Amino acid sequence: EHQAIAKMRTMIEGFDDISHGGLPIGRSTLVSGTSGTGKTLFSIQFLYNGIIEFDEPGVFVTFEETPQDIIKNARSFGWDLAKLVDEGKLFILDASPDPEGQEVVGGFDLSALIERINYAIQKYRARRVSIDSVTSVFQQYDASSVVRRELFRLVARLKQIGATTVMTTERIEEYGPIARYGVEEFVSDNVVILRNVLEGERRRRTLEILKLRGTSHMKGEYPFTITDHGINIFPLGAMRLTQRSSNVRVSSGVVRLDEMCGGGFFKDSIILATGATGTGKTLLVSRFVENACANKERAILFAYEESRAQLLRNAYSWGMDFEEMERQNLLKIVCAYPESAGLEDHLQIIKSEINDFKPARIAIDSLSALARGVSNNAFRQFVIGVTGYAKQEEITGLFTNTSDQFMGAHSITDSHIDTITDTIILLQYVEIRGEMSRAINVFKMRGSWHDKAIREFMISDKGPDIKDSFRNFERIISGSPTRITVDEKSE
Amino acid sequence: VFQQYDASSVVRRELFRLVARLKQIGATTVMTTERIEEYGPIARYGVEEFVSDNVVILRNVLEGERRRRTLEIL
Amino acid sequence: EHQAIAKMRTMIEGFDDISHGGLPIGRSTLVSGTSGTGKTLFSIQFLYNGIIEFDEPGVFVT
Amino acid sequence: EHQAIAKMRTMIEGFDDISHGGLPIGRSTLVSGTSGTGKTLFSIQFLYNGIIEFDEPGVFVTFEETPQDIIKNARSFGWDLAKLVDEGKLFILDASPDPEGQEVVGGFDLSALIERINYAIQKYRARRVSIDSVTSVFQQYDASSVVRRELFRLVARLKQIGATTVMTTERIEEYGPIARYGVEEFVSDNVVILRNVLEGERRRRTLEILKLRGTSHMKGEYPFTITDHGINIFPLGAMRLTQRSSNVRVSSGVVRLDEMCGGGFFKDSIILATGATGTGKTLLVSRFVENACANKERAILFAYEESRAQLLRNAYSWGMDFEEMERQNLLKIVCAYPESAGLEDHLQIIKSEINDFKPARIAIDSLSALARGVSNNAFRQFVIGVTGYAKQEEITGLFTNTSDQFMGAHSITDSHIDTITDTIILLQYVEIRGEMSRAINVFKMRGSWHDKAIREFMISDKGPDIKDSFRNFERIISGSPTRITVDEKSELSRIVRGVQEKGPES
Ligand SMILES: Nc1ncnc2c1ncn2[C@@H]1O[C@H](COP(=O)(O)OP(=O)(O)OP(=O)(O)O)[C@@H](O)[C@H]1O
Ligand SMILES: Nc1ncnc2c1ncn2[C@@H]1O[C@H](COP(=O)(O)OP(=O)(O)OP(=O)(O)O)[C@@H](O)[C@H]1O
Ligand SMILES: Nc1ncnc2c1ncn2[C@@H]1O[C@H](COP(=O)(O)OP(=O)(O)OP(=O)(O)O)[C@@H](O)[C@H]1O
Ligand SMILES: Nc1ncnc2c1ncn2[C@@H]1O[C@H](COP(=O)(O)OP(=O)(O)OP(=O)(O)O)[C@@H](O)[C@H]1O
Ligand SMILES: Nc1ncnc2c1ncn2[C@@H]1O[C@H](COP(=O)(O)OP(=O)(O)OP(=O)(O)O)[C@@H](O)[C@H]1O
Ligand SMILES: [Mg+2]
Ligand SMILES: [Mg+2]
Ligand SMILES: [Mg+2]
Ligand SMILES: [Mg+2]
Ligand SMILES: [Mg+2]
Ligand SMILES: [Mg+2]
Q1: Residues of A annotated as binding site for Mg(2+)?
Q2: Which residues carry this modification: Phosphoserine (chain A)?
């Protein structure tokens, strides 16, 4: 074998996108982290997937959790381990100790195990092996140097054998040593760290491939998720810039608006409506989500500010009946507090819900409601993920941004998502004769020509009624205009 | 190598031996040391640093979920 | 000799600039870093380039 | 000198100033620091200098480096310790352990060593002594209390012997303990600390004297660089404010300006030219450097924004041929990325180049270039340097500063260097009728009278042209003025009809 390194795929959604193929075969990969990070789960999902997708039987070596329990649990992702053991496809090699015993049995057993293990491998023609918390073993009474030699013996034996392993390790500090005895680190070929980062009373699991001897991979931490369908990672960087782009057009829900953008919204595009609280974005959305129903197309509305019932209210008050849209199963509403999760969990609920309703349109009411509390970068990373997924999937996107300062605003968006979007529809308050009058404007349309005027516009039980511009005013943008009333030429 | 059961001083004299002999032979060498904190000591035992005539440090700084590789000639 | 030290070129793209010539001849150089920084590589690349560019065989202790 | 302690001169550049004379005679100075901090140079150089300038034979004790190596390395700077060891002016005493050793030997060897050192000094009649890395000695198997006692002994025997020693030491953390065992700090008479602060990927070395039992000295960290000449410290705080001041005048390369300047810049003055990007500070400097050459003087240009090549294209397009300027051996251009070194370094490169050429005029294009990323307190401290040097050297200076915001800048400099400079020439854009026009202003001159007018100026192939002010304009500094007219049409040369000629004849 005189070729590059060969990698086996884990099938763990996203792990292989980052490990450029996955764990290198015949070698041991180290996946350590703190208590509650997925390690165990990972190893399992490793074997399982291997069995159910390539009939590669597997050996699972547990030094603490009991077989009955490793199974009991797995049923949490809808996995009947018991069966794979009946089918001789998975062998749970119990290595835990019993409530009674002796001592002074250091490496005495590290030599028997390697024999009980090679046993199950050969015997079950195993290709994948996962050793859970190898740490809990020398957690009998050992020091660094002692551990280094035992591991090296193990891995070595396993590399001789030819099995591809994954070793579970426990850490105590999220950013401190890689493994409890800062020794494993160098005893392994590959290293994967699972982190459960606090930061704000909110946690955020992130996975990282520190190293892959002999092959390349992706650097840095990647957010992931532990669900009923196991560990789901999102290589928000992996995503390529190869999204389909068509000239097809779509209605905005507002004829005059469609006219302004010169023919409408491109089917393949991201639309951003920015306005100081009260300018009626949530209106445009409602309207934009109704039009994808009169055309019997499916559409989801992700509101993060208002309730299910309230939306219905304010909706029926503008005409549009959302009651129907529900029944006709063409419109599906979500609603969730940004505080009921993290941007990682959210992005998934979105993506996920998209796949089960196959939307042709999607509206997220208040992106900035989602930027509540979270860091800037983390947020962008969130938009790129939703914005993107929506892009390469042919789903027209309309997201709502509520700037932090009514009147005067010197920038479309505070988070600077500007460049991340195709068409910018900007609403703004204008102070005329001591009254707070609205105005709408197509700031930028990438493909189309769109109108350049800043048009007045009111709201009634009929919805948005766009009017004329303020042709005879100065500094509109600022919010507090100044009528010109020029003495013509004065004859 | 000294991850058998050693302590600083025993590690110091031992490097010194190695390096030294290799100096006699007239060999231009490159030694590899493993660390535990991107900005902590320069090497596992806090001895190696001073012992060597030339030192090079390769780091993989984390920071903001991205890692950046840097190389420093101490 | 009886002058400043002389260096060996590493051909490791750039590094031979950051050291004003390369590793000093007849001496060791400690290259360290945490797991994954690229030491083993750097050590290999030093050897390889040695051979491949001046026919200066090398020894690799592992 | 009023100091109860008689000091000895190191001759290391500026250390003496910092130590108010140099090491105390008959005592020991702990020079400690991490790895690659300068320890061994300092020590070596300390003996060397005593040998070359005072014929004070010296003993050098090494515990790790080999006697062959201390010589080999020492050539790096240009010293032949070999020869000195030959004339018996420098005895190197080897105490490194062997490549084929044993274990145990650090107490009766400390006694044997003292007895050894006494010998060498007695035999060579030495007055200076170094001891490199005593630390590595107890680095066999010891603890705090055993070191203190073993140090004390050595130091005490040394002082009885009457020797002016220097001990080097290692530390782990740049800012934590002073030494390793945390006991060297209190058994030494003096403690000199060397640091190599990382901070933002670059590396800055400083030298600090924590204590001198018995005298005053300069408190705090001071920058220094290691070069082909050894250590070199800059007493950026010892630099007294007693620079010479004359009333002589020197052109600015541009006449009108000169007028505006009461009659041409002061020979002894720091000149500051601020303005938005594109205002033409660069231009002005070019003329200022040129003019010195047109009059047969030497002047250097340090450019941190433009290549030496481009600096010439633009310089020619503005007339003035810099090529010749390089040839006639009057103008010397530098060029250096500010990211290609720290401030301590750039400061010295400049100084050096200022010596090997004796300019009469100096012009640093874009100090705000050097301000990139550095901490203001570190930058302000750089400015003070270059500036100071130039003042106490009778070398006129023309510094450049580019403001982060074009039009609307409410401050001369974003680094508030304002008060360091003596004269300020301002440049800015003026939105006059859908057009960006340049305006030049002489904001302040310390010794002269200077015009208080914000003249408009246009840039051409010939260069700078200084017209007149926008008298009929309010909110000029706003960048985008407002035009109020109580007149305009007023005289100046009314008389209508056919006032001109055309290309044919007049
Ligand atoms: N069905 C599920 N839905 C959502 N989250 C789940 C589900 N099952 C488990 N989890 C989460 O995944 C984690 C399980 O981690 P697991 O026990 O597999 O290994 P570990 O945390 O890496 O190591 P350790 O053995 O110390 O716990 C739990 O902490 C829990 O929050
Ligand atoms: N029936 C109605 N008749 C007239 N105007 C209405 C009616 N309903 C709502 N409005 C107007 O629309 C506004 C409601 O805002 P909307 O739901 O459109 O979202 P928004 O202004 O973009 O964002 P947010 O609701 O978070 O402030 C009210 O402030 C009001 O001026
Ligand atoms: N072909 C490749 N392309 C891109 N990156 C690679 C390639 N091969 C290896 N790498 C990267 O280099 C790392 C390999 O580390 P390397 O073997 O150079 O030594 P080191 O980390 O300093 O020592 P050690 O890994 O033995 O603890 C991998 O972790 C990976 O990120
Ligand atoms: N000619 C030179 N020009 C510029 N820098 C030099 C020159 N020679 C040596 N250096 C620098 O000076 C340093 C030498 O340090 P030195 O030998 O004086 O003692 P140390 O680092 O304090 O202690 P140790 O001997 O244990 O390393 C090196 O870090 C190197 O970069
Ligand atoms: N030959 C020329 N003719 C007319 N105008 C010129 C000529 N050369 C340069 N200019 C003008 O001068 C400007 C160049 O700026 P200059 O090199 O003088 O330095 P600066 O504006 O102070 O600083 P920087 O170049 O770093 O922005 C141009 O933007 C342009 O308007
Ligand atoms: Mg576990
Ligand atoms: Mg490693
Ligand atoms: Mg290695
Ligand atoms: Mg050192
Ligand atoms: Mg030294
Ligand atoms: Mg310039």
Answers
A1: 40, 282, 305
A2: 418
Tell me phi and psi for residue A76, to 5 degrees.
-80, -15
What kind of experiment solved this structure?
Answer: X-ray
Q: Do A220 and B65 touch (CB under 8 A)?
A: yes
Q: Which residues pair with A272 in a beta bridge?
A: A399, A424
Pocket probe for ligand 1: among A30, A34, A40, A42, the residue whose CB has the most ligand atoms within 8 Å is A40
Whose tokens are 């409408």? That residue is A264
Residue D500 lies in a domain: no
Based on the fold, state whether residues A433 and A323 are members of the same structural domain: yes
Which residues are within 8 A (CB) of D172 and not within 5 positions of it... i.e. 6 or more apart?
B41, B46, D34, D180
Q: Which chains touch A (3 or more CB pairs under 8 A)?
A: B, C
CA distance linking residue A455 with residue A466, whole number of Å: 7
Pairing of strands D58-62, A423-426: unpaired
* Chains near C (3 or more Cβ pairs under 8 Å): A, B, D
Whether A451 and A465 have beta carbons less than 8 Å apart is answered as: no
Alpha carbon of C41 to ligand 3 centroid (Å): 7
D480 is in an annotated binding site: no
- Write out chain D residues lying below 8 Å of C4, CB-based: 72-73, 75-76
Q: Say yes or no: A254 and A230 in one domain.
A: no
Q: In the block, which residue shows the tokens 């070129």?
A: C9
Token pair 């032979």 is found at B25
Question: Is the residue at D495 inside a domain?
Answer: no
Q: Domain boundary residue among A186, A213, A236?
A: A236
- Kindly list the residues from chain B whose CB atom is less than 8 angstroms away from the CB atom of residue C26: 23, 26-28
B26: contact with A, CB 8 A cutoff = no
Looking at the CA of A209, name the nearest ligand: 3
Structural domain ending residue among the three candidates D186, D219, D236 = D236
Inside any domain, residue D253: yes
**Domain encompassing residue D289:** 237-484
Residue type, A25: I
Task: Choose the catalytic residue: D185, D305, D326, D456.
Answer: D305
Give B44→chain C minimum CA distance, Å: 9
Give yes or no for residue D279 CB within 6 A of ligand 5: yes
Q: Whose CA is nearest to atom 10 of ligand 1?
A: A226
Contact A145 B5 (CB under 8 A): yes
